[PDB]
Design a protein around this ligand. Sequence first.
Ligand SMILES: NC1NC(=O)[C@H](CCC[C@@H](c2ccc(C(=O)N[C@@H](CCC(=O)O)C(=O)O)cc2)C(O)(O)C(F)(F)F)[C@H](N)N1
Ligand SMILES: NCC(=O)N[C@@H]1O[C@H](COP(=O)([O-])[O-])[C@H](O)[C@H]1O
Length: 200
Amino acid sequence: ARVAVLISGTGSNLQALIDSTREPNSSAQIDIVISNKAAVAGLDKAERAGIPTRVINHKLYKNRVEFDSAIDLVLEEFSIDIVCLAGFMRILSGPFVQKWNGKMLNIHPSLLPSFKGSNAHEQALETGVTVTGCTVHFVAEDVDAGQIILQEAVPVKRGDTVATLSERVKLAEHKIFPAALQLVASGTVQLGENGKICWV
Ligand SMILES: NC1NC(=O)[C@H](CCC[C@@H](c2ccc(C(=O)N[C@@H](CCC(=O)O)C(=O)O)cc2)C(O)(O)C(F)(F)F)[C@H](N)N1
Ligand SMILES: NCC(=O)N[C@@H]1O[C@H](COP(=O)([O-])[O-])[C@H](O)[C@H]1O
């Protein structure tokens, strides 16, 4: 499978994906990295790996559908099979999500369905859980609500900040996100017709 990775920042997940797709017997190759923001570290990581990049600035579009169509155009250019959202911070419109249904994965830093949203760590700490984690899911229109592929539990330490917890969870992210990409790329895991996850 030919893979795009969309990012908005650092790109530590991008890196784990790159390294994993270059292990032998990988069912995936990363062919393009798209950022909605210029001068983010993820872009340099992609270029250092020999992978082409684009910056599609979301602020230069009147609405989400137009921004999403610009992404889609690039995805076709590189005939992409699967899209991974790796720190991508833009909510995608209905038609884009529908088009990529069963073919687009996201990494979220909580054990869904707890702590949906971009500030999951802040929520985990506020709530006072001793166990949080991360989730790879198919992307549905409803944010952080698509079908769960893999999850990994991560302890919260008394006195954790958002920074310390975030770093501990990213270590788990870097395990399950490549694993889940291989599962979907190999056809081992699919979004079944009934809208439910299916393992072959
Ligand atoms: N329709 C659709 N459905 C999805 O399930 C997607 C996956 C969402 C991933 C996450 C997510 C949840 C909320 C936002 C959000 O509010 N975006 C704002 C921009 C906010 C900002 O600039 O901080 C905006 O206006 O776009 C950004 C990301 C996440 O909480 O899991 C995390 F960790 F990535 F942040 C998707 N992109 N589109
Ligand atoms: N679209 C999914 C994405 O928002 N996931 C979350 O954003 C951060 C990105 O870090 P990173 O740029 O070092 O991979 C977190 O690593 C991840 O949980």
